[PDB]
Design a protein around this nucleic acid. Structure first.
Ligand SMILES: Nc1ncnc2c1ncn2[C@@H]1O[C@H](CSCCCCNCc2cccc(-c3ccc(Cl)cc3)c2)[C@@H](O)[C@H]1O
Ligand SMILES: [K+]
Ligand SMILES: [K+]
Length: 545
DNA sequence: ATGGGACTTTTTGA
DNA sequence: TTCAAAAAGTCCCA
């Protein structure tokens, strides 16, 4: 329900928004945490504000009402005019209310804490500074009634498989004063994900993004499987609009290495570079100049993309794998006619250039005509999960029989020579499938269009796609998920661009040698690495890198 | 107990 | 009718 941001990050975000505030010019700054919780950020905002007022108390006393601006009145002034908080949890608000009160009855000091849905509250005024950590809820874990509200009221950033924190970005931007500064920590995925395209467009066209701190797959929150970034933006009048990008280099480092986050950012554990916000396309390609030069060379040289030459499709989605997937040595497969059985592989079975021998079998239950002819299969294998199967969406609507696969796709797409790759991996692993392998959605497949078979072969494609060049090339724009894991999904894999030049024959021949060695009984993996090194040199020569 | 590594389902909107 | 996206991942062990 409540997640605690590390103190080093909270202090960095508060200092990011307030360290250059001119309290003399504006002694009434409105600082808001829209998901304040117990007050991780607001309590630190109090301390920073208190030092700001006390350090200039005599200048304020001289410039303004001398009786009002006293050290004894700082506590009341902060709570009345400066600190604002909102959270849906009553108990967190009550705890934060006590913590703010205990920072110092005389007369009923009013604290601007609201217990509400920040996405529904009618905010009466805008704010100078906004900080905090919004909630993250995906499309599966969000209520259907609430999602209808979000789709209707937040359609500028929320669509399809978008996340809840997209709307908080929109709300924070909307209620930020002109010239104000916002700084939040959110998941990093919107920086590259397809769902975040509208959100990226909304941020780019409404605020100046001062800084992006990208932690990639490092674990910022303990015992939480999320990858985080810090976004700092303003609504100031500026003409340069360049972004400071801090991208981590070592994902295993501990965040408490230094007393402050800015020490870590300046260190060798991070890299810094600048991106012109006016040059951002629908995609935000945030890489240094060497990588940008590398990426642009490959883009310009290559004339084809995988989408042009290939047909992509996602694997089987049974809707209940335990009901339809069995070990190939399971005795219950004696009850199933071999015409119903398909080879079944997982992502771990995909290597470079080849697929491991399958150990599981899929019951393609869609080919079972009626319940009477194959009652034994239904009663003894599939029916053990009938209650769970009946709860699938297409079963409740009558589109699918209780024993059918939820998304059985087309058999002919799988029962052919094709290339398969895992949906999440640390490296490029594209394999030729010779054995008509089926898979779940953790493996993606594609086959070459007929009109392009004379230009590109499967052996050539796996040669370049598994090379170190294309491993680096794909990861420049790929979606970073967690420690040493990128998404390998068609929405980016099919955008990979490929080339064809005088090195085609030698590259294809080297790949065939690698494939031949990998399929032998006594595999000498040593020569495979040497052949791969030779191929990488050819590809680098081909692409002029 | 916590931190780190291998591995990855099916619900869901369109 | 039927596609493909989505980690506040999930789980195990030292
Ligand atoms: N709409 C909101 N408006 C304002 N504040 C808001 C709004 N949502 C959230 N918060 C605040 O964000 C603040 C910080 S982010 C964290 C909020 C995530 C809430 N979802 C996650 C979630 C959804 C469903 C069930 C559960 C759940 C229940 C019980 C158990 Cl054992 C385990 C899990 C959790 C928090 O203190 C929140 O009170
Ligand atoms: K005065
Ligand atoms: K992480």
């Amino acid at each position: 329900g409540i997640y605690y941001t590390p103190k080093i990050i909270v202090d960095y975000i508060v200092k990011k928004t307030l360290k250059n505030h001119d309290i003399i010019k504006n002694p009434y700054p409105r600082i808001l945490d829209i998901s304040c919780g117990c007050g991780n950020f607001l309590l630190e905002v109090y301390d920073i504000l208190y030092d700001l007022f006390e350090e200039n108390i005599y200048e304020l006393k001289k410039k303004y009402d001398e009786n009002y601006w006293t050290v004894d009145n700082i506590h009341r002034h902060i709570l009345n005019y400066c600190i604002y908080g909102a959270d849906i949890d009553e108990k967190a608000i009550s705890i934060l209310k006590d913590s703010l009160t205990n920072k110092k009855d005389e007369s009923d000091i009013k604290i601007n804490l609201f217990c509400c849905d920040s996405l529904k509250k009618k905010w009466r005024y805008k704010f100078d500074y906004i900080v905090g950590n919004p909630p993250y809820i995906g499309h599966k874990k969000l209520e259907k009634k609430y999602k209808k509200f979000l789709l209707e009221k937040y359609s500028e950033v929320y669509k399809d498989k978008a996340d809840l924190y997209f709307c908080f970005y929109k709300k924070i931007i909307d209620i930020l004063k002109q010239g104000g500064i916002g700084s939040v920590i959110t998941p990093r995925y919107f920086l590259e994900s397809l769902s975040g395209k509208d959100l990226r467009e909304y941020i780019k066209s409404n605020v100046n993004v001062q800084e992006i701190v990208d932690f990639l797959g490092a674990n910022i929150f303990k015992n939480i499987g999320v990858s985080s970034c810090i976004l700092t933006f303003d609504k100031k009048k500026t003409k340069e609009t360049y972004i400071d990008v801090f991208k981590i280099k070592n994902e295993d480092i501990c965040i408490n290495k230094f007393e402050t986050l800015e020490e870590l950012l300046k260190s060798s554990k991070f890299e810094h570079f600048n991106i012109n916000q006016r040059l951002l396309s629908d995609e935000w390609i945030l890489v240094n100049k060497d990588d940008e030069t590398f990426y642009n060379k490959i883009q310009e040289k290559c004339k084809y993309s995988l989408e042009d030459i290939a047909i992509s499709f996602q694997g089987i989605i049974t809707g209940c794998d335990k009901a339809f997937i069995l070990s190939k040595d399971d005795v219950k497969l004696n009850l199933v006619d071999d015409k119903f059985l398909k080879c079944w592989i997982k992502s771990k079975n995909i290597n470079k250039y080849i697929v491991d021998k399958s150990e599981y079998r899929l019951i393609y239950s869609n080919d079972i005509d009626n319940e009477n002819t194959n009652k034994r299969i239904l009663d003894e294998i599939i029916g053990l999960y009938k209650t769970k199967l009946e709860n699938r969406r297409e079963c409740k609507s009558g589109i699918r029989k209780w024993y059918e696969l939820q998304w059985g796709r087309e058999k002919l797409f799988f029962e052919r020579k094709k290339i398969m790759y895992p949906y999440k991996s640390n490296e490029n692993r594209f394999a030729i499938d010779y054995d008509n392998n089926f898979s779940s959605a953790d493996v993606y497949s594609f086959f070459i269009k007929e009109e392009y078979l004379d230009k590109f072969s499967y052996e050539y494609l796996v040669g370049i796609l598994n090379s170190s060049v294309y491993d680096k090339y794909f990861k420049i724009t790929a979606k970073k998920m967690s420690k040493n894991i990128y998404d390998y999904y068609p929405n980016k894999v099919m955008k990979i661009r490929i080339f064809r030049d005088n090195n085609y024959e030698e590259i294809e021949n080297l790949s065939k040698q690698i494939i031949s060695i990998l399929l032998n009984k006594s595999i000498d993996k040593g020569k495979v690495e040497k052949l791969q090194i030779k191929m990488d040199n050819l590809i680098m020569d081909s692409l002029g890198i």
